[PDB]
Design an enzyme around this catalytic site. Structure first.
Site, mmCIF file in Angstrom:
data_model
loop_
_atom_site.group_PDB
_atom_site.id
_atom_site.type_symbol
_atom_site.label_atom_id
_atom_site.label_comp_id
_atom_site.label_asym_id
_atom_site.label_seq_id
_atom_site.Cartn_x
_atom_site.Cartn_y
_atom_site.Cartn_z
ATOM 1 N N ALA A 178 0.826 -1.198 0.000
ATOM 2 C CA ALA A 178 0.000 0.000 0.000
ATOM 3 C C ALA A 178 0.866 1.257 0.000
ATOM 4 O O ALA A 178 1.821 1.355 0.771
ATOM 5 C CB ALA A 178 -0.931 -0.011 1.195
ATOM 6 N N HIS A 238 -6.873 6.295 5.472
ATOM 7 C CA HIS A 238 -5.527 6.751 5.824
ATOM 8 C C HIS A 238 -4.778 7.252 4.594
ATOM 9 O O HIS A 238 -4.162 8.313 4.623
ATOM 10 C CB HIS A 238 -4.703 5.635 6.486
ATOM 11 C CG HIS A 238 -5.202 5.205 7.833
ATOM 12 N ND1 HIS A 238 -5.830 6.060 8.713
ATOM 13 C CD2 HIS A 238 -5.127 4.007 8.464
ATOM 14 C CE1 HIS A 238 -6.141 5.403 9.817
ATOM 15 N NE2 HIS A 238 -5.722 4.158 9.693
ATOM 16 N N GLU A 239 -4.842 6.476 3.516
ATOM 17 C CA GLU A 239 -4.076 6.756 2.305
ATOM 18 C C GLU A 239 -4.667 7.906 1.499
ATOM 19 O O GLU A 239 -3.938 8.648 0.837
ATOM 20 C CB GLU A 239 -3.965 5.499 1.447
ATOM 21 C CG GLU A 239 -3.246 4.360 2.141
ATOM 22 C CD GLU A 239 -2.872 3.242 1.196
ATOM 23 O OE1 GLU A 239 -3.785 2.565 0.670
ATOM 24 O OE2 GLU A 239 -1.656 3.039 0.989
ATOM 25 N N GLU A 271 1.185 11.359 8.290
ATOM 26 C CA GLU A 271 0.491 10.114 8.590
ATOM 27 C C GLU A 271 -0.694 10.381 9.515
ATOM 28 O O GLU A 271 -1.646 9.602 9.561
ATOM 29 C CB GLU A 271 1.458 9.107 9.223
ATOM 30 C CG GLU A 271 2.807 8.958 8.497
ATOM 31 C CD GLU A 271 2.734 8.198 7.164
ATOM 32 O OE1 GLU A 271 1.754 7.449 6.924
ATOM 33 O OE2 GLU A 271 3.680 8.345 6.354
ATOM 34 N N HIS A 279 9.709 -2.084 6.917
ATOM 35 C CA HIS A 279 10.360 -0.778 7.004
ATOM 36 C C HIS A 279 11.865 -0.859 7.233
ATOM 37 O O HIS A 279 12.587 0.092 6.926
ATOM 38 C CB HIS A 279 9.700 0.086 8.075
ATOM 39 C CG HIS A 279 8.281 0.446 7.767
ATOM 40 N ND1 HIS A 279 7.266 -0.486 7.734
ATOM 41 C CD2 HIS A 279 7.702 1.640 7.497
ATOM 42 C CE1 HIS A 279 6.126 0.118 7.449
ATOM 43 N NE2 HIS A 279 6.363 1.409 7.302
ATOM 44 N N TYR A 328 5.403 7.221 12.781
ATOM 45 C CA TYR A 328 4.152 6.583 13.173
ATOM 46 C C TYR A 328 3.876 6.753 14.660
ATOM 47 O O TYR A 328 2.717 6.829 15.071
ATOM 48 C CB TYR A 328 4.137 5.104 12.781
ATOM 49 C CG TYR A 328 4.494 4.851 11.331
ATOM 50 C CD1 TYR A 328 3.601 5.166 10.300
ATOM 51 C CD2 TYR A 328 5.727 4.298 10.985
ATOM 52 C CE1 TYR A 328 3.934 4.931 8.964
ATOM 53 C CE2 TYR A 328 6.067 4.059 9.658
ATOM 54 C CZ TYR A 328 5.170 4.375 8.653
ATOM 55 O OH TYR A 328 5.515 4.135 7.342
#
Ligand SMILES: *[C@@H]1O[C@H](CO)[C@@H](O[C@@H]2O[C@H](CO)[C@@H](O[C@@H]3O[C@H](CO)[C@@H](O)[C@H](O)[C@@H]3O)[C@H](O)[C@H]2NC(C)=O)[C@H](O)[C@H]1NC(C)=O
Ligand SMILES: [Cl-]
Ligand SMILES: [Cl-]
Ligand SMILES: [Cl-]
EC number: 3.4.15.1
Lengths: 581, 11
Positions: free
Chosen positions: A315, A344-345, A372, A470, A480
């Site tokens: 994603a 979110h995106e 974010e 990550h 985050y």
């Protein structure tokens, strides 16, 4: 003087726009259509960016930044003085690109296989096993299996990755790569600030942890759960035990008050990935915010294609530095977890559209955490039972505690993990954790922060951090942690803007114009001003604060305190050396 | 940080 500085910024900004647009479309065409042809185009655009960053970075260094009267000009030039990887000598630069490529490729095609059976991929297969299976050995199979295939094979590239990324950072005036990453927040007291915020959310996490441990004790049996020890890491419904929402069925305080299975209702009522993004688009526009352009719907890969294989399914939201072209790339599965992620995106897409008029250098969030945060704030309102019932996905005090528990499993559980990742990395980058210590120190911090132990003892050769996307992709993770804190600050501020009273967790800012206005002016700043200004525009205050998150979960904290006290739970993991038998 | 900001990804 000032005249030559703005002449430089103008020239940089228009040349960067062109080359950045060329890099992104090359990055898109590869990720959406993997071919030798598309790979070749990507590699040619890689060295162009490097050439351009080298050229313009060298010139930017000729200016004395503190001699400049304009702060907007000052910020842009001071950013360009940092070349990142493009500071490396040619050979080391291309070797660094090889290593990142090798690490990402190894992660992406890693498969766990049965003897004669099928070869499962991380997504969606192993994710599904972690989420749905309630059998100890099956969860263990997928957990151990993934770390044995993905993690182990990353370990051969990581020490050389650390070496090169550290070198590039030292050539840009930093002491190490961790120093370089932290500087993006422009906050000297950053380390202490995150530490303090972590401490304030401790009692809330410990109470959740103690409660969940007991529930797992009930399901998995007394011989597999120590009520005064760490929880085995494979039992939390998530591969990395970063978010615990999938084990809701195991921990729901009142099954006495049932609720609809959201994923069942979505597949039944004909929800498509396309339709999940339409719904997220509607939520933004209801606030009076910008709709997505038609080009977004044409060019976005909202689900995996069938015409030809070979695509990257991870994603991601894409800015093409065009002002007109913004896309999402995701192999969306129809479920609640992907409906939340969709919001979110779209939050990233909104952010792109808001600051699109700024010069490309300032086309970012106030800090990486801000970016974010937008999308997560809205999803909080989306997550509310009032809004989900209106989507035909649900159907009272006992229902209220249920919901707060579901949100705690998502949000509270993530706090120690998001903190944990870069606490490990910074120590790797600064050299207090060496390659002989990689895995032991990872599990030291897993125990210290999260109260987790490995289900199976780890051996030399294991590199479990490399099983988290990550890490081999070299994407900073503290963003985050900042995100999860400040999104509850934004929520609290937007709800009182909408004139909502009563418990903060009940607030649903859908169709709130005043709330849309707040975020709009904040997002318009982009990276042009230090983040405390954008923080002040939204919240009235310039600080990161845990108070809003604490205020949100107050009813649940009170309830957990009461419940843990009466069942005789010891908070934390006093017998911290315990592992499974 | 002079490179183009990579596409944004979930945690
Ligand atoms: C420092 O330099 C920057 C960039 O050259 C200056 O920022 C500019 O500020 C003006 C307002 O003073 C902005 O105008 C605004 O946007 C549009 C024009 O694009 C206009 O229609 C609005 O009415 C509004 O006034 C302009 O956008 C902005 N430029 C950039 C590139 O962001 C700033 O004024 C300079 N400051 C000093 C003290 O010299
Ligand atoms: Cl792990
Ligand atoms: Cl970050
Ligand atoms: Cl980035």
């Amino acid at each position: 003087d000032e005249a030559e500085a703005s002449k430089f910024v103008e020239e940089y900004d228009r040349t960067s726009q062109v080359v950045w647009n060329e890099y992104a479309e090359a990055n898109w065409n590869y990720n959406t259509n993997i071919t030798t042809e598309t790979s070749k185009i990507l590699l040619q655009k890689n060295m162009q960016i490097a050439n351009h960053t080298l050229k313009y970075g060298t010139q930017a260094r000729k200016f004395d930044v503190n001699q400049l009267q304009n702060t907007t000009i000052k910020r842009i030039i001071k950013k360009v003085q940092d070349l990142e990887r493009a500071a490396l000598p040619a050979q080391e630069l291309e070797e660094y690109n090889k290593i990142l490529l090798d690490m990402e490729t190894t992660y992406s095609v890693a498969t766990v296989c049965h003897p004669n059976g099928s070869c499962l991929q991380l997504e969606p297969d192993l994710t599904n096993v972690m989420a749905t299976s309630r059998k100890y050995e099956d969860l263990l199979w997928a957990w151990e299996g993934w770390r044995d295939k993905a993690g182990r094979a990353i370990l051969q590239f990581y020490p050389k990755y650390v070496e090169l990324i550290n070198q590039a950072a030292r050539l840009n005036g930093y002491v190490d790569a961790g120093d370089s990453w932290r500087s993006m927040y422009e906050t000297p007291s950053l380390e202490q600030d995150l530490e303090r915020l972590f401490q304030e959310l401790q009692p809330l996490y410990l109470n959740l942890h103690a409660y969940v441990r007991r529930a797992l004790h009930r399901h998995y049996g007394a011989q597999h759960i120590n009520l005064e020890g760490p929880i085995p890491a494979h039992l939390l419904g998530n591969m990395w035990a970063q978010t615990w929402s999938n084990i809701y069925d195991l921990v729901v305080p009142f099954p006495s008050a049932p609720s609809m299975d959201t994923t069942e209702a979505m597949l039944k009522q004909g929800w498509t990935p396309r339709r999940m993004f339409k719904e997220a688009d509607d939520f933004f526009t209801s606030l009076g915010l910008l709709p997505v352009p038609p080009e977004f719907w044409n060019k976005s890969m909202l689900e995996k294609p069938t015409d030809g294989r070979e695509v990257v399914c991870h994603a991601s939201a894409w800015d093409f530095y065009n002002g007109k072209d913004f896309r999402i790339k995701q192999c969306t599965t129809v479920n609640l977890e992907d409906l939340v992620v969709a919001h979110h995106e779209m939050g990233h897409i909104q952010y792109f559209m808001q600051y699109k008029d700024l010069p490309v250098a300032l086309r970012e969030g106030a800090n990486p955490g801000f970016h974010e945060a937008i999308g997560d704030v809205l999803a909080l309102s989306v997550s509310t039972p009032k809004h989900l019932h209106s989507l035909n996905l649900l159907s009272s005090d006992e229902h209220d505690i249920n919901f707060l528990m579901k949100m705690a499993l998502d949000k509270i559980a993530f706090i120690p993990f998001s903190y944990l990742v870069d606490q490990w990395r910074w120590r790797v980058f600064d050299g207090s954790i060496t390659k002989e210590n990689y895995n032991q120190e990872w599990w030291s911090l897993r125990l210290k922060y999260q109260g987790l132990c490995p289900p199976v003892p780890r051996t030399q050769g294991d590199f479990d951090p490399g099983a988290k996307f990550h890490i081999p992709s070299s994407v900073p993770y503290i963003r985050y942690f900042v995100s999860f804190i400040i999104q509850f600050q934004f929520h609290e501020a937007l709800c009182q803007a909408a004139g909502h009273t009563g418990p903060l967790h009940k607030c649903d800012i859908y169709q709130s114009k005043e709330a849309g206005q707040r975020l709009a002016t904040a997002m318009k700043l982009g990276f042009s001003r230090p983040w405390p200004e954008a923080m002040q525009l939204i919240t009235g205050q310039p600080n990161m604060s845990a108070s809003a998150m604490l205020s949100y979960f107050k009813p649940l904290l009170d309830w957990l305190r009461t419940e843990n006290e009466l069942h005789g739970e010891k908070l934390g993991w006093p017998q911290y050396n315990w592992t499974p038998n | 940080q002079g490179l183009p900001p990579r596409p944004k990804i979930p945690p």
